[PDB]
Amino acid sequence: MLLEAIFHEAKGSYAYPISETQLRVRLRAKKGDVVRCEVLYADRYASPEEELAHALAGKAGSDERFDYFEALLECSTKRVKYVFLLTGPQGEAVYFGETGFSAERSKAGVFQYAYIHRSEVFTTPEWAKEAVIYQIFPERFANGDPSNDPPGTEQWAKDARPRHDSFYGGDLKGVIDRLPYLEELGVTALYFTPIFASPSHHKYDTADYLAIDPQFGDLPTFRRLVDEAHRRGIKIILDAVFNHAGDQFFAFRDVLQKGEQSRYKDWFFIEDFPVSKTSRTNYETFAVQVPAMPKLRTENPEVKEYLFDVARFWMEQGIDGWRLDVANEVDHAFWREFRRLVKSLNPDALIVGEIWHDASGWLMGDQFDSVMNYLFRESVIRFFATGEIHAERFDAELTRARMLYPEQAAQGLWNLLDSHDTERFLTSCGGNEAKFRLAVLFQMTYLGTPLIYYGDEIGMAGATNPDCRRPMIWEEKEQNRGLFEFYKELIRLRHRLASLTRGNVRSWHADKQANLYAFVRTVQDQHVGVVLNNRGEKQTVLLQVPESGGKTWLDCLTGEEVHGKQGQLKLTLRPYQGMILWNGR
Amino acid sequence: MLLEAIFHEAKGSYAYPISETQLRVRLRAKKGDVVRCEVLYADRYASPEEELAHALAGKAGSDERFDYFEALLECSTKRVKYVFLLTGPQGEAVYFGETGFSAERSKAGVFQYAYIHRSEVFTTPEWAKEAVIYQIFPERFANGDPSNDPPGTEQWAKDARPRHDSFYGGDLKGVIDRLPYLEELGVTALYFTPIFASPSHHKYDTADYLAIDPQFGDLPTFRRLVDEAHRRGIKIILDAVFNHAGDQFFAFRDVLQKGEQSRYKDWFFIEDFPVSKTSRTNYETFAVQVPAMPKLRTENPEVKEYLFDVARFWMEQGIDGWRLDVANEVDHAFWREFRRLVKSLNPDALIVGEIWHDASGWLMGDQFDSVMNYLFRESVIRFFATGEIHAERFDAELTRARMLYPEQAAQGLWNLLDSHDTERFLTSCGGNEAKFRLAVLFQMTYLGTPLIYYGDEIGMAGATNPDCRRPMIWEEKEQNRGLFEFYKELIRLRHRLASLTRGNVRSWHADKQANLYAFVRTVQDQHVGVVLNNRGEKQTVLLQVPESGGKTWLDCLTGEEVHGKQGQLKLTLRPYQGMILWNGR
Ligand SMILES: [Ca+2]
Ligand SMILES: [Ca+2]
């Protein structure tokens, strides 16, 4: 075998505890290069003569070029040393240890996970493990209070097409009035984009972190919203913009006024005074040359303390978690301490980051609970919407992403289809509802946290920002109720099937020709197989199914009862049809 | 090329800053697969159609199976995205990014290092960068005060062969009385094994963390040592045993007496009560079944606070750093807060850990400054002492270890030859001084921090514990002055040639047949080539030397001047001779 392609490290996503006495370990090798992977381990202090314990590492999946093997080590002592025994296709075996590879175990050396502290077991909120989150763009969800509308608010109609500076009067009172709707849909949490006081239309340039923007509401109204959503089993998540503040931020206006005499000058990154200019700026900002968005020096104990007080203030209002913005530009110490603060105030408070690249450095257990799964969106777009990739590629991309972080993070990843900054998924599907639905069926049954973008559940369409920010369609006759019921049904199933929320995922079938993909979610003895026929054709397929997993399944969507004969399940799907097979366990 | 063998990650030891605006990046590939490696990068927010900056990554080294390439990216914005352009032996051009590999730059995507925070730039003490540590085993270094000598103390002679429980009376007073000796040698720091009050001989079972053990001295004496050492340019490093306390530790004593009613019961890991019994332990301890060494619950904020106070106490006494014992069994948060505390009280205080496996998790810059380089010792023993490995294997071992951590850590790793727990290195060489000297020559000119084990510089020998803990030989007649002068000479050169302390490392020559190995240390325009003839035979070697780095060199050990002709240098080395060639720059 090709040893230079084999990999493992005793940390990060390849070695991490799931409990105080259990260490999950993962190893990758060139695809098809390793047939069997066994882990020989023992307590780090075991005598050089004691027998080692064996752990067969099953193949958790494979992507474009790699095979992923996964094992679980039982370490009652909370300390462990281990070596891998790898067997190739033609029987050649080799031990893989910290020292390297060798036919002899001793020369291979041994990896070591020094100690498993309970405080370092990646732990996330139970409710978030089976949540369905709904993204609200407040300005356009519901206008419950016309008296707070910005000057020049345009009419709220379906035939409306938002402009970069449009206004429709969306506010918090509206969200309250429409909570019955959200409860009926079945969402377990609402995620709001910035709603703190800001002079701009987007609100990403914060003026007052301790106040709701007047056009959206005020503290009393926000408290009501929190309480009304809670009694309806709906949690509240706010968007925290701690990387940078607005130019109206009290601290920044002070610097603009007193210059180098300001007591808050070190709360920012200023090259030279005075602080301003035309098309020019002498201080670090969000992105490049964005005057209204001066970057905050979070490394400053004073800045950190202030933002932490902001965090305390809103959590005291009863919110259930945070969605960080440009989190990757704030230092790690801030995030480690942020988690400590947040969790000490509310163990169930969720911390979600938004990072457009490998976020492993933030998903170890000491910082964020999860991040936006942009990888999930890209794979769903190219597979169900544009058709740029086929079932096998789809499978590879999905698997590769899955092996990116520890299972506690991957299990809570926010799986979005679109957002206020992208075209609506329906439009990506060119208006084809059959493709749109197949994608939602996948989203609702895949590993991670489903995130619904307001309006998608009733079939709203739209081009990217700002056309994706149209006023929510509330007229029932104008809503796609067929779709609405589809979402509600998928949501109900997800809550009733433990494997869809707390189960693992394994690819079941992948056919590039028929463009059909199937996977299985598993929890204990329960198995739920999802088969997706992503073709505008009636296709038939043969799936492998050993009696151990059962011989009878039930399609939770149609009630049909399928039967496997001789370890095979014959299925015939309609164009863009998806089946959700439950093994009755 | 084997694409599944190529590696890089935008963090850890493969992507890290060396300053606020410079990012060091490393890429691993199967040896020989890549002949040229370039990096195309830009600010993360740069426009697509914007021209990318170029950075050539030279081959930093190779080990048994891989080539390691290294480049330096200039990032004025402190934000960078990048993709590698790898060229193979046949001229194939493949791009490598976060997405994967592709013949097209766009399809390979880019890695991203979100933001470089100055507080995240790995920083170590300046004095530690060019230090020479001397390990002192107090009981055997010098008996300065017989009044504190424990009962049964033996004689202090060369022919004294220590027993497991022998005594000689070494103490702090003795250290002070011998400071002139240590100053002459040229050591800049003293590393002491545990010396806090303990009822055992070894003192690893701390009874009182706030007191010097009576057999070694008292606080007034310790202070005197700190001051007298300091005015001698000698710093003091203490052994911190924070993973576990002794059974005499006040908190544990209270638990043994008040059991379940004990106020400090949660300061330890107790299975059941009563907290103890005959020959049996019901609480977690160091290693396995060591009743005298109860494990401390450093996760308990109260335990952390106490241990932090302990650190404050000794730092107020003027010490310059800590050598942590069993540090990998203490939680990470503890070490991060420890560093924060230690650096706040004294930015120049050093923190060294001891971990017998990949310590990358503690060497990111937020925890330890460095760790003992056990790999260095293993490589020097097999190459210089036992001859189990030849020059090429030796080269590979060094390179592999060198690429384990970021440069800031690698530069300060303690490169020891032996310790109180191993046989004397001279003994490892079977008494062959010629081999012993070549290893020392190497130790004194290689990357890292040289650590002298008391007595090695005067020719002391001995088998492992306790024969390696023999009474220090103080009779000049009994001391190997020739060797002493050799050490002193090497130490002077190290302090005068900046490249030997702050320069990088590049293998220069490695021949498995001649068993000759050479490397070059480089800083600014200065180049110091170290040539090692590790064979009992006069040999000649032709080394490659492009005129760019100079054409004339001076052997700093003999005064001999060598000249290169047409890019080549002909050197004739005597049996086990090492040369230290300075390029006059
Ligand atoms: Ca309104
Ligand atoms: Ca004494």
How far is residue A212 from each of residues A138, A177, A218, measured CA to CA in Å?
Answer: 12, 18, 5
Domain boundaries along the sequence of chain A? 1-121, 122-242+298-502, 243-297, 503-585
Preferred mutation among A107, A337, A357 to probe B, highest tally of B CBs within 10 A: A357
CA A534 distance to own-chain centroid: 24
Catalytic residues of B: 325, 354
Q: With respect to CATH, is domain A243-297 assigned 3.90.400.10? A: yes
Using CA atoms, how far apart are residues B360 and B14, in angstroms rounded to an integer? 11
Which among A370, A383, A398 is positioned nearest to A61, based on CA atoms? A398
Chain centroid to Cα B371, Å, comes to 5
* SS3 state at B72: strand
What are A54's strand-pairing partners? Answer: A40
Cα–Cα distance measured from residue A121 to residue A78, given in angstroms and rounded to the nearest whole number: 12
Q: Which ligand is nearest to the CA of A471?
A: 1
Q: Does B478 touch chain A (CB under 8 A)?
A: no
Equal fold, B122-242+298-502 vs B503-585: no
Task: Quote the minimal CA–CA distance from A259 to chain B in Å.
Answer: 23
CB contact under 8 A, B30 and A66: no
In whole angstroms, what separates CA A569 from the centre of its chain? 33
Partner A, chain B 33-72, Cβ-Cβ below 8 Å = 43, 45, 64-66
Q: What is the C-alpha to C-alpha distance for residues B63 and B392, in angstroms, rounded to an integer? A: 9
CB B267 within 8 A of CB B302: yes
Ligand nearest to the CA of B149: 2
Topology classification of domain B503-585: Immunoglobulin-like (2.60.40)
Count of A–B CB contacts within 8 Å? Answer: 94
What is the Cα–Cα distance from A140 to A174, expressed in whole angstroms?
10
Token pair listed for B294: 């109860």
Cα(A200) to centroid of ligand 1, in Å?
16
Q: What are phi and psi of B226, to 5 degrees?
A: -60, -50
Contact B2 A2 (CB under 8 A): yes
DSSP single-letter state for residue A294 = B
**If you measure CA to CA, which chain A residue comes closest to B327?**
A114
B149 touches chain A (CB under 8 A): no
Which residues, numbered 284 to 313 in chain B, qualify as contacts with chain A under a Cβ-Cβ cut-off of 8 Å? 287-288, 299
Q: Assign B347 to helix, strand or coil.
A: coil
From ligand 2's centre to the CA of B158, what distance in Å? 18
Catalytic, out of A70, A354, A395, A397: A354
Q: Which of B4, B98, B357 sits opposite A66 (nearest CB)?
A: B4
How far is the alpha carbon of B221 from chain A, nearest alpha carbon, in Å? 37
Q: Among the CATH numbers 3.40.950.10, 2.60.40.10, 3.40.605.10, 3.40.10.10, which is that of B1-121?
A: 2.60.40.10
Q: Across the interface, which of A5, A98, A331 has its CB nearest the CB of B120?
A: A331
> Do strands B370-371 and A111-113 pair parallel, antiparallel, or not at all (unpaired)?
unpaired
Q: Tell me which of A325, A369, A395, A457 is the catalytic residue.
A: A325
Q: In what order do the strands lie in the sheet with B189-192?
A: B370-371, B350-353, B321-324, B235-240, B189-192, B133-136, B449-453, B414-416
**CB contact at 8 A, A463 and A427:** yes
Would you give the distance in Å from CA B255 to the centre of its chain? 38
> Looking at domain B122-242+298-502, which of 3.40.640.10, 2.60.40.10, 3.20.20.80, 3.40.50.12170 is its CATH number?
3.20.20.80
Chain A positions in Cβ-Cβ contact with residue B77 (cut-off 8 Å): 288
Torsion (CA) A260, A266, A271, A277 in degrees, nearest 10: -70
CA A236 to the chain's CA centroid: 16
The span from the CA of B445 to the CA of B500, in Å, is 6
Partner-chain residue, chosen from B10, B287, B299, that has the shortest CB–CB distance to A358:
B10
Assess B331–A contact: CB distance below 8 Å, yes or no.
yes
Entry resolution in angstroms? 2.3
Residue A69 — φ and ψ, nearest 5°? -110, 140
CB contact under 8 A, B329 and A30: no
Task: Tell me if A70 sits within 8 A of A55, measured CB to CB.
Answer: no
- Answer whether A120 touches B (CB < 8 Å): yes
Antiparallel, parallel or unpaired: β A22-30 and A36-42: unpaired
How far, in Å, is the centroid of ligand 2 from the Cα of B215?
Answer: 6
- The reply to whether A302 belongs to the active site is no
- The verdict on a CB contact (< 8 Å) between A5 and B10 is no
Euclidean distance between CA atoms B290 and B235, whole angstroms:
33
- What beta strand segments (E) does B162-214 contain? 189-192, 196-197, 208-212
- CA pair distance B309, B147, nearest whole angstrom: 31
Chain B nearest-CA distance from A465, in A, is 19
Q: Lay out the sheet containing A561-563: strands in order across.
A: A504-511, A516-523, A526-533, A578-582, A552-555, A561-563
Q: What CA–CA distance (Å, rounded) separates B17 from A400?
A: 28
State yes or no: is A64 an active-site residue: no
Q: How many CB atoms lie within 10 A of CB B496?
A: 11
**Solving technique:** X-ray
**Cβ distance of A64 and B100 shorter than 8 Å:** yes
Question: Which of A3, A45, A357 lies at the smallest CB-CB distance from B98?
Answer: A357
Contact B71, B40 (CB under 8 A): no
How many CA atoms, within 13 angstroms, populate the side-chain half-sphere of residue B43? 11
Q: Say if residue A48 is preceded by a cis peptide, omega within 30 of 0.
A: no
